[PDB]
Amino acid sequence: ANKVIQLQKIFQSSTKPLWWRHPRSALYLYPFYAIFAVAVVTPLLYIPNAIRGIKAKKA
Amino acid sequence: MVQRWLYSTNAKDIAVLYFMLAIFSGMAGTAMSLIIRLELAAPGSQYLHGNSQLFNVLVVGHAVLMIFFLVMPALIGGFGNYLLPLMIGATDTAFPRINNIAFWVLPMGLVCLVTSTLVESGAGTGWTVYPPLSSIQAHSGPSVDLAIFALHLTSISSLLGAINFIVTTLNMRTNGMTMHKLPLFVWSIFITAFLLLLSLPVLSAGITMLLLDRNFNTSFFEVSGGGDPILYEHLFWFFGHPEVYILIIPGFGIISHVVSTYSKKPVFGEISMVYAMASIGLLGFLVWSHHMYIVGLDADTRAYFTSATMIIAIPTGIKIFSWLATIHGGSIRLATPMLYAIAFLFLFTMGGLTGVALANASLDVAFHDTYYVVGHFHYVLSMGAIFSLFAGYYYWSPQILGLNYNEKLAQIQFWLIFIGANVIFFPMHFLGINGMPRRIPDYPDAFAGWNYVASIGSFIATLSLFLFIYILYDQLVNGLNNKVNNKSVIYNKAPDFVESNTIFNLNTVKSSSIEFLLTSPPAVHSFNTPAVQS
Amino acid sequence: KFVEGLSNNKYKIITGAWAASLYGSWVIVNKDPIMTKAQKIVQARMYAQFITVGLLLASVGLSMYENKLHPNKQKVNEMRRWENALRVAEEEERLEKEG
Amino acid sequence: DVPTPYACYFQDSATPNQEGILELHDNIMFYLLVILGLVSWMLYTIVMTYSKNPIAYKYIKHGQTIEVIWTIFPAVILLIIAFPSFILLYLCDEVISPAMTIKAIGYQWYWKYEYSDFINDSGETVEFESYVIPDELLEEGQLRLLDTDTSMVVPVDTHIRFVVTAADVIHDFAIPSLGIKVDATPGRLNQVSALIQREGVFYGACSELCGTGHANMPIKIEAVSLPKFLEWLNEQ
Amino acid sequence: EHAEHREHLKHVPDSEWPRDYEFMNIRSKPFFWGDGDKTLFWNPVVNRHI
Amino acid sequence: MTHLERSRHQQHPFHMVMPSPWPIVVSFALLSLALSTALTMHGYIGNMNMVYLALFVLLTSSILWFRDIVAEATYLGDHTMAVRKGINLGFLMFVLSEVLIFAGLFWAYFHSAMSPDVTLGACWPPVGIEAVQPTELPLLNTIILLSSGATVTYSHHALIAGNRNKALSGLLITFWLIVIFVTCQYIEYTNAAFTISDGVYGSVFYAGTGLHFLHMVMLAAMLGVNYWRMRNYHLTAGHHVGYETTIIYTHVLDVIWLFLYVVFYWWGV
Amino acid sequence: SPLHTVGFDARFPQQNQTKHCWQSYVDYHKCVNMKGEDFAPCKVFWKTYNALCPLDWIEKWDDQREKGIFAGDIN
Amino acid sequence: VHFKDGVYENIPFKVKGRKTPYALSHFGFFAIGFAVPFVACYVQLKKSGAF
Numbered sequence A: 001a002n003k004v005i006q007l008q009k010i011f012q013s014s015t016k017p018l019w020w021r022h023p024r025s026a027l028y029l030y031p032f033y034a035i036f037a038v039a040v041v042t043p044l045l046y047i048p049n050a051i052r053g054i055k056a057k058k059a
Numbered sequence B: 001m002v003q004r005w006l007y008s009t010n011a012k013d014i015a016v017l018y019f020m021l022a023i024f025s026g027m028a029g030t031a032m033s034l035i036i037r038l039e040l041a042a043p044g045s046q047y048l049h050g051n052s053q054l055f056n057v058l059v060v061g062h063a064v065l066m067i068f069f070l071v072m073p074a075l076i077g078g079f080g081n082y083l084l085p086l087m088i089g090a091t092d093t094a095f096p097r098i099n100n101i102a103f104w105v106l107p108m109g110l111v112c113l114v115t116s117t118l119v120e121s122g123a124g125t126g127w128t129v130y131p132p133l134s135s136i137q138a139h140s141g142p143s144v145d146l147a148i149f150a151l152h153l154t155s156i157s158s159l160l161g162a163i164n165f166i167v168t169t170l171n172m173r174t175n176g177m178t179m180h181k182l183p184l185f186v187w188s189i190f191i192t193a194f195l196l197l198l199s200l201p202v203l204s205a206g207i208t209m210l211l212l213d214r215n216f217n218t219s220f221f222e223v224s225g226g227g228d229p230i231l232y233e234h235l236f237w238f239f240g241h242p243e244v245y246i247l248i249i250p251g252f253g254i255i256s257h258v259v260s261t262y263s264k265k266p267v268f269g270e271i272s273m274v275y276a277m278a279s280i281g282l283l284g285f286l287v288w289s290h291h292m293y294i295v296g297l298d299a300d301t302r303a304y305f306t307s308a309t310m311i312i313a314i315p316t317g318i319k320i321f322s323w324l325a326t327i328h329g330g331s332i333r334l335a336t337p338m339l340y341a342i343a344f345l346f347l348f349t350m351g352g353l354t355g356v357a358l359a360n361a362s363l364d365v366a367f368h369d370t371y372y373v374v375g376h377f378h379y380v381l382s383m384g385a386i387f388s389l390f391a392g393y394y395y396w397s398p399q400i401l402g403l404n405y406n407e408k409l410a411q412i413q414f415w416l417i418f419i420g421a422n423v424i425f426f427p428m429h430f431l432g433i434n435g436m437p438r439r440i441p442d443y444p445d446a447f448a449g450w451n452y453v454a455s456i457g458s459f460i461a462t463l464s465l466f467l468f469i470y471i472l473y474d475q476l477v478n479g480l481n482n483k484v485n486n487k488s489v490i491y492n493k494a495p496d497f498v499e500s501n502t503i504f505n506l507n508t509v510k511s512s513s514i515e516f517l518l519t520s521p522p523a524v525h526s527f528n529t530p531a532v533q534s
Numbered sequence C: 001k002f003v004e005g006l007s008n009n010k011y012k013i014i015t016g017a018w019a020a021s022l023y024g025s026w027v028i029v030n031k032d033p034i035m036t037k038a039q040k041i042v043q044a045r046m047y048a049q050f051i052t053v054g055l056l057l058a059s060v061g062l063s064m065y066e067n068k069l070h071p072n073k074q075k076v077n078e079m080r081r082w083e084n085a086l087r088v089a090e091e092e093e094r095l096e097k098e099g
Numbered sequence D: 001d002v003p004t005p006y007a008c009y010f011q012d013s014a015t016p017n018q019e020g021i022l023e024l025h026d027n028i029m030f031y032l033l034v035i036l037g038l039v040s041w042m043l044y045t046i047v048m049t050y051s052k053n054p055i056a057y058k059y060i061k062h063g064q065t066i067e068v069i070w071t072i073f074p075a076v077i078l079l080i081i082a083f084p085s086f087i088l089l090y091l092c093d094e095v096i097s098p099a100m101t102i103k104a105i106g107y108q109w110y111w112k113y114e115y116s117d118f119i120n121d122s123g124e125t126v127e128f129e130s131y132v133i134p135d136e137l138l139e140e141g142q143l144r145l146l147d148t149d150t151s152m153v154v155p156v157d158t159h160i161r162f163v164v165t166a167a168d169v170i171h172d173f174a175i176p177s178l179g180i181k182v183d184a185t186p187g188r189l190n191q192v193s194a195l196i197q198r199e200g201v202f203y204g205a206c207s208e209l210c211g212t213g214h215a216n217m218p219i220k221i222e223a224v225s226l227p228k229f230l231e232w233l234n235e236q
Numbered sequence E: 001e002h003a004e005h006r007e008h009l010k011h012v013p014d015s016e017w018p019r020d021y022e023f024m025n026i027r028s029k030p031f032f033w034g035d036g037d038k039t040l041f042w043n044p045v046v047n048r049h050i
Numbered sequence F: 001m002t003h004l005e006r007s008r009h010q011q012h013p014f015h016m017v018m019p020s021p022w023p024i025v026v027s028f029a030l031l032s033l034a035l036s037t038a039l040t041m042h043g044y045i046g047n048m049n050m051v052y053l054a055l056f057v058l059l060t061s062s063i064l065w066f067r068d069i070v071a072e073a074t075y076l077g078d079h080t081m082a083v084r085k086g087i088n089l090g091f092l093m094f095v096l097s098e099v100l101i102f103a104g105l106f107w108a109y110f111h112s113a114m115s116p117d118v119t120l121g122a123c124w125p126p127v128g129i130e131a132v133q134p135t136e137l138p139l140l141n142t143i144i145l146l147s148s149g150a151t152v153t154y155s156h157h158a159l160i161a162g163n164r165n166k167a168l169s170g171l172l173i174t175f176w177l178i179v180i181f182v183t184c185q186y187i188e189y190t191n192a193a194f195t196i197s198d199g200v201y202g203s204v205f206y207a208g209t210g211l212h213f214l215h216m217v218m219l220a221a222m223l224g225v226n227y228w229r230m231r232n233y234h235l236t237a238g239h240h241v242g243y244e245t246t247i248i249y250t251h252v253l254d255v256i257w258l259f260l261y262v263v264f265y266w267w268g269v
Numbered sequence G: 001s002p003l004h005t006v007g008f009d010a011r012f013p014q015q016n017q018t019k020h021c022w023q024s025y026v027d028y029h030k031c032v033n034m035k036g037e038d039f040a041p042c043k044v045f046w047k048t049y050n051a052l053c054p055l056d057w058i059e060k061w062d063d064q065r066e067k068g069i070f071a072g073d074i075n
Numbered sequence H: 001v002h003f004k005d006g007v008y009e010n011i012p013f014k015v016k017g018r019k020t021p022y023a024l025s026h027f028g029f030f031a032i033g034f035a036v037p038f039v040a041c042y043v044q045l046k047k048s049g050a051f
């Protein structure tokens, strides 16, 4: 609803990093770090079974 | 410390991350070549207990690491991202987050290539991963998939960096620099980025086709189903010859800088060098089937391809004659980059002459998949591109690091690698002309005689690499003292014959590019106000 | 008469006609310049492929103008190829029997 | 016919193709040695007379009357080395009136040969697989990684046509002294010709990476006179 | 007139189906999802692997 | 302006981007995607939850990168004329790379079709394969693409002409026509006789038009974000470069769909 | 000499000869419906396909013509 | 961000003021790279029963 001047006055007069300057940034950024932290380390846990040759249980 | 190096957005930091990864992966590929060459030293199983699959996996790792993880991120990734903004007067590259992801997708390609080695048996297929060997019948398991993903992440890096380079030198040149007044290294990175942009799509298409063939039951190159592996050979080598001209064109730029600054006279006919590089890049797309002379083409196909493969000897000959003309009549200052440049000018021409021996499809039936081809390309690779890479390091390292290297140790290192590389790669022509095939872990006993001397030369080459590691250590620790004592060359240009030692002191550097005028180690904000040129 | 003689040059004339329509409409869209070059390219191309798809449905119109000439091809000159490949085996069988 | 230790030249020719390949290679190597002597002499004399030169002729940049010469002269030497190459290329492709066909099918780490002409009194097609003699069962005097248990026997002074294909992966039917190198891909049939000029035995190997048995995949061709070929074919 | 052709094709069981040619329904390894032979847009009326 | 006040700005027109985490985050997401798909393709991981998580993380990290680009371009005023020219040139080099991917795929189709095999029967389309006829639904798919370009052209020129309702409505019509095309391609893929496993024909056909399908679903996404930014007044009458890149993208997907049409549906039947 | 072989053919005088053996096979098997038994020149096709086409392919194609999966027109 | 200038501030690794010797970091950076194919060789030979 044309908040662009009001958002310019926040994004320019701010100290926080650019991905944190919006008021709603804590709603995006805090779940994403948890989802990212499991998404990058769960294949690394399956790397040793793939080296040993152990397939997962499907039946 | 995490924002400067993990969240990085300046090109001069991403360049040294590229350089650290490049020299790490070059240590990896040199270790792999030492294992290959140690197994090849004598007939019979020597060090790997039989197990020719492990030999083939090591050959794959050696080729992929040395091409896509040493020479490309060294030359393009380090030297282009560092020097092209500094030599066109740009404050940074255009699109810098792209420039950061084009580095950080390379350790991920490295870890997936290493676990490609560690899963079931590795992908022993050659670096040209040909089906049906690279299929799911002949290579069961996740090895080849992870190798294909390594190639995908490296192609993502070298495509994003190519877009970055093209735009940042078409758009961010400083305010006197027309396109005709560019340095030759900038033209090198420019033409290389176009070759990357035009060639990496077809490779990505071909190896995604292979990946879908392996895992998604589709049949692009499956014969029982309607495929053809010659389609893979076409789609691969349409990238594969532009790839090897990509590997050599920044080397041409580095040599044209080094030769001119150590001959103390400008390059003979600079715009013809630009035209020659552009002609090599254009004609490199028209020659791709000289790697396919045996597969069963027509005679007129092979006649055109000998003609087109032959007529690229003209611009490379123009470049090499221009290098001889720009050292003729000079005042040669025999420093380590000059030694590497003269060794380039000899050994690259020997590799190119064996290349025009290979260009004749009439004759390539005697040399295909022999060690003669291995001799040609290891000449023009490990004595063209590696020698120009060493020349670029010894040419730019004290400027962009702030620390000088030991000059005597550098010349010892040069003479050891120049001896050792010749001793590896010169008998390979004898083996290949007598009929020794490629990619074999074991050979008939009549090939033992030159194989032994080649693997003796391998130890000279890796000894000079270990000496280079010590040269890096001595530069990083004692590099401020090498300026004080007489262990290093401080000025790469001597005074002219009537120039006083005091009149030299007001004009210590006499360069035709901005790189040697900057502050040593250059500022985080170079070019606050823009540089200006008539 | 002329109809199949340039109806097997069918997908080699329509791409040339596309190139003709774009690179011909280019001068008519570029003769009045105030738009940027990209808008001229997209409007000339927008006209040109309306032309090629209209000409392509005229292509299928010609395709069934034209093979009430001789019915049931895609095999009646595999007939030709197989018929004379047959009796060129005949021309060899005889004078190796009598030669 | 066989590699020798410390060799540096081709194996001894046995077909007109290989003896033409040798002459084209030497004709190319002639002008290649001219160019190598030129650029190595310049690279020697320049750094040995201008390393000790203290005044650099820094105003030599153009050279118009000689840039055209070193553009033109590589082109005419390309033309000179390209004149016999085209003649050999258009001579080696014709397979005109051969007196024998032989199919060679590369399986994974054996070759399978198939004489298919029914010139026999048996009238049936002759096929056999030729495996490498393994290192533990080599009887004394045999050539390691070259000798096989069965052999491909061919008459001399006979135009032979090799039709080459594969079964699973890409192989390469290659014999250097006969001068044939032909890719066996699992979809198609290539052909080469040969005329063996002298009797003997000629070795070759798979020159295409087949997998883990790639080094253990040799070719052995015994060329005999036509009586002895016939009496060999009468058994197998 | 194609939905009605699928309507009358729903009444033709698989022994009355035409036998697949050699290149049809390549099965190198089973697909890693689902039940094996079914692909991503496998409509079981128009597609059948017997 | 004075020297004292000119010294408080940049002296050169180029964007010095602040340090950002999304390069290394997207790089680790591509790592997790590669390592997850290479292990679920071979059964070392039970289900597709790791691949789903990896693709979701990849998409959201790209979205946060694009959010920061929108923030730089709109709320900080960092995109000058030189930066605009550079972004347009980078997008043009990008679409040239993707046209070359499609040229490789067309090479695959032509190498299979110019002289086909003997295992299909020296035939194209192969025996038993019921080819998609070019008259029924793909003709409507060409029509709703040539019309989508005509809608986005007046939407663009009405964005320049000061109109708001005539540009938003044209953008909405363009977006809905693109999703009409995507649902029609889904309907064709369901009611197609051959599958992707049905030989080299199904391979090359679904490869080409499925890559076009993926480019069209990304086109629908960027038309949606352009509608969002035009409704919320981010796009202006003189500075709309993401909109311009989307227009370039529509008009190259149009011509490569035409090449796919006349090759895969007319010459190849 | 009793040695006789397929000569080169003007339809296929290049290096690849896949459509020599496949064409002579489909020409032989589409003789014997239109031609029939004991016909003297359909052994020209027989010598041509069995001299240069490999045994795996011949038995695969004969199996496919008993299937109804042969991709030629011999009925 | 404004970053530090100077001689040793352009490298991600520490050289001068360290509680450990630098040659540790320097030569263990390269010995790991020289030792990846030996780890590769060891595991693909233990998988093939040669050890």
Ligand code: HEA
Residues within 6 Å of the ligand: B022, B023, B025, B026, B027, B030, B033, B034, B036, B037, B040, B059, B060, B062, B063, B066, B067, B070, B071, B074, B125, B126, B127, B128, B374, B378, B381, B382, B386, B389, B390, B393, B421, B424, B438, B439, B440, B458, B461, B462, B464, B465
């Ligand atoms: C970048 C190209 C490159 C380089 C430099 C090398 C270097 C070497 N290579 Fe090889 N090689 C290939 C590319 C290269 N190779 C390719 C493409 C294949 C084909 C694979 C296939 O057939 O599928 C191959 C295959 C190949 C074969 C054929 C084996 C086979 O066919 O299976 C052999 C033979 O022994 C070999 C050995 C060597 C040896 C002993 C070196 C030695 O020269 C190593 C000595 C070199 C150095 C010591 C360089 C310095 C090291 C650095 C790290 C530079 C650092 C400097 C800076 C960072 C400024 N490699």
Ligand code: HEA
Residues within 6 Å of the ligand: B128, B244, B245, B247, B248, B290, B291, B309, B310, B312, B313, B314, B316, B317, B318, B320, B348, B349, B350, B351, B352, B353, B354, B355, B356, B358, B359, B360, B364, B367, B368, B369, B373, B376, B377, B380, B381, B384, B385, D035, D039, D074, D075, D077, D078
């Ligand atoms: C550094 C990269 C690089 C460069 C620059 C070259 C340069 C050339 N190469 Fe090479 N080549 C490779 C990398 C490179 N190559 C690789 C990696 C392979 C193997 C891939 C694989 O199989 O795995 C290969 C293999 C390869 C083949 C395939 C053979 C086979 O696989 O069977 C051919 C065929 O023509 C070829 C020829 C040439 C020619 C004609 C040049 C020319 O550009 C050289 C031009 C230079 C000169 C000619 C010398 C200087 C000129 C003069 C002094 C003027 C006077 C001379 C004349 C007039 C002749 N090389």
Ligand code: CUA
Residues within 6 Å of the ligand: D106, D107, D108, D109, D170, D171, D172, D206, D207, D208, D209, D210, D211, D213, D214, D215, D217
């Ligand atoms: Cu058969 Cu290598």
Ligand SMILES: [Ca+2]
Residues within 6 Å of the ligand: B039, B040, B041, B042, B043, B044, B045, B046, B441, B442, B443
């Ligand atoms: Ca050995």
Ligand SMILES: [Cu+2]
Residues within 6 Å of the ligand: B240, B241, B244, B290, B291
């Ligand atoms: Cu090449």
Ligand SMILES: [Mg+2]
Residues within 6 Å of the ligand: B368, B369, D207, D208
């Ligand atoms: Mg080969």
